[PDB]
């Protein structure tokens, strides 16, 4: 819609002000910021880096709507059957008495 | 001049094509087999006994 | 006079088109169909 201007360094709120799923992950809980997705989302919104939330989503949709959709439809593995036809590992081996051709030399 | 000549030739060609398509060309795969081809295979191997 | 065509108009009324000023106006008040 309207032009977007990146916030200045002084306009960015401190990390400690961000909230997680339950509450702020302040001192003694900073390392939990890496694992809390909601805290990261709130931090990105505060820092005006909202694209981090939107770009992965849209692209993913595109990737599904273009390339993986048909790949799954045409070459994907369906559910296995009840009675499974496992491989006996008997096929392929050369028969007894066969004289294979020599390798290149 | 160039476009006039080109379009004259194109018009003649399209007239011939229209006549052939809508008055002479038989539709393929006829039920009675009296008109049109039934199709055939192409690109078949030739002179490759090892293939079989 | 001959039966030849003239400057094409595209079926537009030059007295109300978006570029009407580009067409000169005669004494009768009818804008020309050509420059």
């Amino acid at each position: 819609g309207e032009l977007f201007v990146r916030p200045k360094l002084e306009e960015i709120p401190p990390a400690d002000q961000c909230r997680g799923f339950f509450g702020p992950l302040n001192d003694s809980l900073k390392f939990l910021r890496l694992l809390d997705i909601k805290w990261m989302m709130n931090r990105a919104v505060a820092m005006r880096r909202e694209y981090l939330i939107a770009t992965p989503t849209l692209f993913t949709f595109i990737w599904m709507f273009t390339w993986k959709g048909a790949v799954i439809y045409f070459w994907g593995d369906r559910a296995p059957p009840r009675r499974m036809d496992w491989n006996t590992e008997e096929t392929g081996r050369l028969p007894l008495g066969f004289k294979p051709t020599p390798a290149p030399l | 001049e160039i476009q006039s000549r080109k379009k004259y030739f194109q018009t003649l060609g399209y007239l011939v094509a229209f006549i052939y398509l809508y008055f002479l060309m038989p539709k393929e795969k006829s039920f009675s087999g009296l008109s049109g081809p039934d199709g055939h295979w192409i690109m078949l191997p030739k002179g490759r006994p090892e293939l079989f | 006079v001959g039966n030849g065509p003239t400057f094409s108009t595209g079926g537009e009324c030059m007295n109300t088109c978006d570029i009407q000023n580009a067409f000169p106006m005669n004494d009768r008040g009818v804008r020309s169909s050509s420059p």
């Binding site: - | 039920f31 199709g39 055939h40 002179g47 | -």
Partner: protein, 103 residues
């Protein structure tokens, strides 16, 4: 003065149009063509019989059978295939002769 549409010949203008005017569209079109010819370019015999004929499949002459017969005859004759080989029949030549004498 120079202009692509007025001065260049048709193939050159086509290349310019689809390379420096609508390149993404051409790329996507080629992608879609490849997909169509890779996954939507086959028709089984049953499908042809059901829907492949204007008025219906003329079973009274079975054109598909004749087409396949001509195909296989041409392949056999050109490639010099011995259709009597045990792999094709599943039995030895002598067994085949015995069966022929039996039936």
């Amino acid at each position: 003065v120079y202009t692509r549409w007025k001065c260049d010949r048709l193939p050159v203008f086509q290349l310019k149009l689809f390379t420096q005017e609508y390149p993404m569209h051409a790329a996507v079109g080629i992608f879609t063509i490849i997909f169509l010819w890779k996954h939507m370019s086959h028709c089984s015999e049953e499908t042809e019989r059901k829907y492949g004929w204007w008025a219906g499949y003329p079973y009274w002459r079975d054109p598909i059978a004749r087409r396949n017969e001509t195909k296989y005859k041409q392949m056999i004759i050109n490639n010099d295939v011995d259709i009597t080989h045990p792999k094709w029949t599943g039995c030895s030549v002598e067994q085949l002769e015995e069966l022929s004498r039996v039936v």
